[PDB]
Amino acid sequence: HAFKPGDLVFAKMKGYPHWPARIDDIKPPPNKYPIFFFGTHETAFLGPKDLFPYDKSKDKYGKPNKRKGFNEGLWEIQNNPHASY
């Protein structure tokens, strides 16, 4: 299926590691989605090339690291992904 509000992902941006995030509701640029980043609580627009479904990718990307907000972000995605941070 296509990405929908509430889908959980690792979202990739230049110079950050694959980051726990979710697809929010709202207008983005075409073919792009509003991404909410767990832990930092920042938003950005990203296309599906940069969006890795959480469940399939967690073994690979769901590891602690020292980037700021990151480990807090792993707790949110796993324990309360739909809350209103």
Residue 36 lies in a domain: yes
Q: In units of Å, what resolution does this entry have? A: 2.1
Yes or no: say if 24 and 6 are a contact pair by the CB < 8 Å rule. Answer: no
2 inside domain: no
83 assigned to some structural domain: no
SS3 8: strand
| Tokens standing for residue 72 | 């807090």
| Rounded Cα distance, 14 and 62, in Å | 18
Domain presence at residue 12: yes
The tally of domains found in the chain comes to 1
Residue 52 token pair: 């890795």
User: Which method was it determined by?
Assistant: X-ray
CATH of the domain at 62: 2.30.30.140
Domain membership flag for residue 85: no
**DSSP letter at 31?**
T
Q: CB burial class (10 A; 0-12, 13-18, 19+) of residue 83?
A: exposed
Q: Which residue range(s) make up the domain with 38?
A: 8-76
